[PDB]
Amino acid sequence: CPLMVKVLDAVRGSPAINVAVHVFRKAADDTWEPFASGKTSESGELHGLTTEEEFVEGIYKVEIDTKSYWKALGISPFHEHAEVVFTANDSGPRRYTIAALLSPYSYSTTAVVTN
Amino acid sequence: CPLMVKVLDAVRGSPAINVAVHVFRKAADDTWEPFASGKTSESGELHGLTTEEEFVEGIYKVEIDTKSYWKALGISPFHEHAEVVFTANDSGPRRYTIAALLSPYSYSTTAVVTNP
Amino acid sequence: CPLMVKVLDAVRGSPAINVAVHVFRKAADDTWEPFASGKTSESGELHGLTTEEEFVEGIYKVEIDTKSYWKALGISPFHEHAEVVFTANDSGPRRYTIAALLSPYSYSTTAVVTNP
Amino acid sequence: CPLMVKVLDAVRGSPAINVAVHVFRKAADDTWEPFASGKTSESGELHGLTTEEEFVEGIYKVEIDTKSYWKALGISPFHEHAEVVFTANDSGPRRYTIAALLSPYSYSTTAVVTN
Ligand SMILES: O=C(O)C1(c2ccc(-c3cc(Cl)cc(Cl)c3)c(F)c2)CC1
Numbered sequence: 001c002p003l004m005v006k007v008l009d010a011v012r013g014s015p016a017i018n019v020a021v022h023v024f025r026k027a028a029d030d031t032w033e034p035f036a037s038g039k040t041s042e043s044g045e046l047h048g049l050t051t052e053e054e055f056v057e058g059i060y061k062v063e064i065d066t067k068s069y070w071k072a073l074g075i076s077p078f079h080e081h082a083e084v085v086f087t088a089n090d091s092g093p094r095r096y097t098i099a100a101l102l103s104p105y106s107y108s109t110t111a112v113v114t115n
Numbered sequence: 116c117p118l119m120v121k122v123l124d125a126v127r128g129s130p131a132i133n134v135a136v137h138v139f140r141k142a143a144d145d146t147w148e149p150f151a152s153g154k155t156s157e158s159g160e161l162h163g164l165t166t167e168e169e170f171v172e173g174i175y176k177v178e179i180d181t182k183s184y185w186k187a188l189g190i191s192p193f194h195e196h197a198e199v200v201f202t203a204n205d206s207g208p209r210r211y212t213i214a215a216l217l218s219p220y221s222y223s224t225t226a227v228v229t230n231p
Numbered sequence: 232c233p234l235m236v237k238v239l240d241a242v243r244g245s246p247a248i249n250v251a252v253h254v255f256r257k258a259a260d261d262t263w264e265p266f267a268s269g270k271t272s273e274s275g276e277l278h279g280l281t282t283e284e285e286f287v288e289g290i291y292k293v294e295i296d297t298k299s300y301w302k303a304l305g306i307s308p309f310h311e312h313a314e315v316v317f318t319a320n321d322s323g324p325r326r327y328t329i330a331a332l333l334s335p336y337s338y339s340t341t342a343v344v345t346n347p
Numbered sequence: 348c349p350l351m352v353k354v355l356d357a358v359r360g361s362p363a364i365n366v367a368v369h370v371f372r373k374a375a376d377d378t379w380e381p382f383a384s385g386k387t388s389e390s391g392e393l394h395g396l397t398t399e400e401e402f403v404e405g406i407y408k409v410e411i412d413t414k415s416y417w418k419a420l421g422i423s424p425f426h427e428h429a430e431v432v433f434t435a436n437d438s439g440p441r442r443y444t445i446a447a448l449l450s451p452y453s454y455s456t457t458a459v460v461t462n
């Protein structure tokens with residue numbers, strides 16, 4: 001599991017459950033090619049997006065579908081989605097966790113890059 | 116104005132208005148002495164807590180009364196308050212802005228320290 | 232000034248100075264059209280991106296060039312940029328402040344939306 | 348495990364390893380009584396602080412020793428420590444996670460309260 005996403009909800013104080021997450025890779029022509037997607041679990045986590053063989057160096061975009069998340073809870077949100085854009089570099093550690101903390105008018109994101 | 120506090124509300128997307136703030140300073144006996152207090156304005160800013168003369172070197176605690184803020188909006192939040200504890204002025208007088216971003220179960224704070 | 236951007240540096244405890252910002256607007260063909268750009272001042276603020284007349288209703292992307300900021304300070308950061316994507320002015324004209332707090336492997340953003 | 352603490356480092360993009368964490372309970376006389384303590388693991392987590400029997404309703408303070416953490420990495424920090432103060436309420440969920448994201452001049456904290 002070289003890429004994991006974990007999402008928390010700062011309003012309810014809970015994992016962000018059943019959030020859609022789409023991952024894209026940047027292609028030669030500067031367009032975003034679908035790469036992986038899924039919905040966060042009851043623990044706010046999304047595992048099994050990719051394999052070591054498929055996850056090569058390059059620029060990736062993780063789009064978190066926050067607007068749908070907030071509307072399903074009856075909450076008025078600001079953002080269309082949260083976007084996390086980063087380069088995967090085989091220099092330094094092998095396992096990427098993208099963590100995000102959601103509020104209706106804010107979000108925070110960090111990277112936990114290990115082993 | 117060497118100590119200021121700015122607070123934003125991450126649910127409404129707005130300044131956090133009427134947030135009470137209490138500042139304490141660690142005394143010679145290692146207790147927290149009340150130093151200054153105030154509330155955020157319509158802009159989410161709190162000016163005039165202290166003076167350059169009174170804001171001497173020490174360890175300060177800025178307590179932002181987040182529970183009282185959320186309860187006044189009819190929300191039951193997680194935290195009692197947000198605490199920001201730091202040593203001030205140890206390399207000479209500085210101007211400190213303590214900024215905070217509030218949600219019911221979460222907050223962020225940062226410090227902006229400038230040399231006038 | 233209906234769209235402003237403020238950026239702080241969580242490592243230095245200081246405004247984030249000379250941060251490039253590019254704003255895009257989604258066009259009729261669903262592509263991102265360049266809308267406006269600028270850089271943060273010595274205060275970490277970017278004023279004068281747009282006008283009330285030009286800042287019409289639409290979906291906007293504010294791209295904060297965090298990688299370029301960190302690399303200019305000699306640091307190799309994680310993210311390419313921070314993106315803030317939102318619908319603006321759908322209930323009439325508003326004033327938007329996009330605030331961001333940067334670290335090498337992390338950022339926070341918030342929006343402050345006011346009705347003049 | 349009714350109380351867990353998990354700490355991340357926003358400068359290195361890693362768990363915050365070997366951070367000292369002290370938990371206090373507020374006593375009748377408004378003083379802070381030591382309750383539990385430990386050091387975060389290689390995953391940035393601190394498990395086994397308390398038991399269901401010991402963790403009663405009341406006001407708790409979690410002090411994270413950030414200043415020592417940053418100085419051991421050779422980084423100049425702002426805060427003396429990070430402090431998270433909250434009421435434990437048997438109304439609503441049973442398991443508390445205090446999560447924190449550390450920078451030299453900032454920190455973020457959230458609560459994940461589940462089951
Ligand atoms: O003029 C502005 O926009 C200032 C500013 C700049 C950045 C922030 C900010 C603070 C936190 Cl704790 C988190 C975030 Cl995302 C922005 C903030 F609360 C306030 C100094 C108040």
Ligand SMILES: O=C(O)C1(c2ccc(-c3cc(Cl)cc(Cl)c3)c(F)c2)CC1
Binds near residue numbers: 101354446448456
């Ligand atoms: O495995 C994960 O995703 C966990 C996690 C998820 C998110 C955070 C976190 C906390 C804050 Cl205050 C801010 C951000 Cl972006 C992430 C965190 F500290 C820890 C639970 C450990």
